Every structure is written in structure tokens, then in C-alpha cells.
């Protein structure tokens, strides 16, 4: 493509400036090793305490103890998969245990009390 005169002429009307050129890259074909699906269950169990119990009634919210690599996005998806409910917020607390306590605010359209019964929590 490039007929050498063109590059020379561009620099000719310039006082230096910078550079510019480009060149390609290629991915291999040999299949880098290790195929895996090591995956933790973010929801472990609904955490059960006196302070958990009151909140279910009061504010439509189950309280779980969850992994130490928790966020809000993954856990909301997980709650939807496993208990068929929409979660409106997830709230994150470090514990002196060294794991993360999750307060998960649930939908009013299917009440946390009647979610609770099949994965009982006090």
C-alpha cells in the first residue's frame, strides 16, 4: 500500500511532533491448559439470630450469612435463583467471624415471612 514518498512528505511539513505506525497481533492455537468451574455458593444459609428474626416481620428482609467475596450483584441473582424472589437491596457487614453478614431487602410482592418457612429462620 504505502509508497514511501507519502510518509516522507508528512514529516516534511512538520517540525517533528510524534510518531505513528501500527502492526498486528495473533492469538495461538494450542489451547492453554486448565479447564475449571471452581465456584463457591455465595448463599450458605439464612443466618439466625434474635436481631435477624425481628427484621423479617418489620421490614420484609431475610438475613443471610454469605461468602467473604460477596458484593450486591451476584447475591441478588443468587436469591432470585434459589428462592424465586426479587431483592431490592443487599447490605454488607464485616463480622469478627471473618465472613460477611448480608441483610437482603426483599420484595413486598412475595413476603419474606412466607419465603422464610421453607428455609426456616428464627
Amino acid at each position: 500500500r504505502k509508497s514511501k514518498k507519502i510518509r516522507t512528505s508528512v514529516t516534511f511539513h512538520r517540525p517533528k511532533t510524534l510518531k505513528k505506525a501500527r502492526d498486528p497481533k495473533y492469538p495461538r492455537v494450542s489451547a492453554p491448559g486448565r479447564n475449571k468451574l471452581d465456584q463457591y455458593q455465595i448463599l450458605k444459609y439464612p443466618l439466625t439470630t434474635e436481631s435477624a428474626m425481628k427484621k423479617i416481620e418489620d421490614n420484609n428482609t431475610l438475613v443471610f450469612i454469605v461468602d467473604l467475596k460477596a458484593d450486591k450483584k451476584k447475591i441478588k441473582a443468587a436469591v432470585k435463583k434459589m428462592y424465586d424472589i426479587q431483592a431490592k437491596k443487599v447490605n454488607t457487614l464485616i463480622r469478627p467471624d471473618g465472613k460477611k453478614k448480608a441483610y437482603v431487602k426483599l420484595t413486598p410482592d412475595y413476603d419474606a415471612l412466607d419465603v422464610a418457612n421453607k428455609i426456616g429462620i428464627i
Binding site: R14, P15, K16, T17
Partner: protein, 255 residues
Amino acid sequence: MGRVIRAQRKGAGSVFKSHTHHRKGPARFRSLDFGERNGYLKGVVTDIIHDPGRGAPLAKVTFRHPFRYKHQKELFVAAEGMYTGQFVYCGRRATLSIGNVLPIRSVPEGAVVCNVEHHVGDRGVFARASGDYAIVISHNPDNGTSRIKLPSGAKKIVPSSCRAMIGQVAGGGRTEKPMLKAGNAYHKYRVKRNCWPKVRGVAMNPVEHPHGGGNHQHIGHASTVRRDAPPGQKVGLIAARRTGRLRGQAAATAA
């Protein structure tokens, strides 16, 4: 022997260094394209900005013209009588008015200048401290050499291509009238690179300083030490031609 003395501490380190960053910017002179018969590089004084780093002003001259590779802007050294909105001309064929900078050859003999270049493009070497000025002593039709009598009084051979600015530098008289406080002295030295109080060599311990020690106050030995003397040794009045109070003069070369 002794612990190391205070001069050697310059070295590097923030503690001995000044706040050079606070200082307001470059003092540089924009390197002429060519030409300059009145206003081919036209500057406009828009401010005269104080420089804390020498406590005397540099005129803010703003060159603004475009292209892309155009190089412009910033602080040429202030001269007397300059005003805002007056145009500044920088280059070879520039008109002879105060505050304009041009090669020394085109400036006539006997003419007061401020700034000179000690080889082209080093931007200002001779006379920059306030109320001082060089006066260009000789030229003739000499391609090689312009001779300038400096504020030191020395007559210097320097190339005729070297730029100088017409006028004397501004802020004169600065040093002449007395501080009349220790506290006024402190503030000036704080802003520049100097540590303020001078402890005398006598007042220091014999370990720290050669002149220290002794029951009564005195410098123990002759103050004058050799120029050839090495670092550490070299103290007092170094290589003094004479001492005691009479009848010297300025630097007086002859040709």
C-alpha cells in the same frame, strides 16, 4: 578532628532546598524564527507579575499566535518604563525602544542594556539583579566581537549575535535602604534558598568549626586560608588580595 561543617550539607535534600515550585515560572526568551521588522512576533504586556524567587518583577508578555509549532508565552524580564498594552518585539530587526530584545550588534555603542547572553540562547546572564545594568562599550564594524562593560566593571568579549534587552532592569533601589528588623530579613531569606541566622565560628564548638573553642572569645588562627586548600580546610577569607578597610576599586580590566 571533627564533625562535618554546615556548607557540605548543601548536597541534596528538601531541608536545604527552597520551594522552587512556588516560584512563578520560566524567565526564558522566545527563540526568534527570523526577521522581526516591527511586529512579526508581537507580545502584549498584560500584567507585570512579581517573582517571589528573586523579589523583583518579570513582565508578563503574552504571545498567543497559533500555527502548531508556534512556541510562545511567558515571562520576559521587566525593564523600566514598560506599561501594560505596550507591544514587545523580539528579534533581529526590532525597533529600538525600551523593553525590546534584539542582537547587541544592532544596538549602538554607549547604550544601556539589561540582560546579555554569554553565548546565544542562554537567555540572560549579565545584569539581572535590580538597579544594575551593563553598558555596551565598543563595537566598531566587528563581525566577531561586541565588547560590553559589565556592572562588575569588567570588559567582556562576547559574540555580536548575542541578544540584549534595551533599558535597565526594574525594581531598583531594593537593597539600598535598610531592613530595620531581624524579622524583615527572615521573610526574604525564607522565600529564597538560604538558611537565615548566621552563627559565628567562635560561638561554635572546636569539633564543629576550626575557629571555635578557647576560654575567651577569639578566632584562634589567621582567617585567610589558601584557594588551593582542599574542601574542609578552606575557611575564612579565601585568597584575600588585601584586608583592612581601604582603597580598592571595581573589577578593572584593561585593553
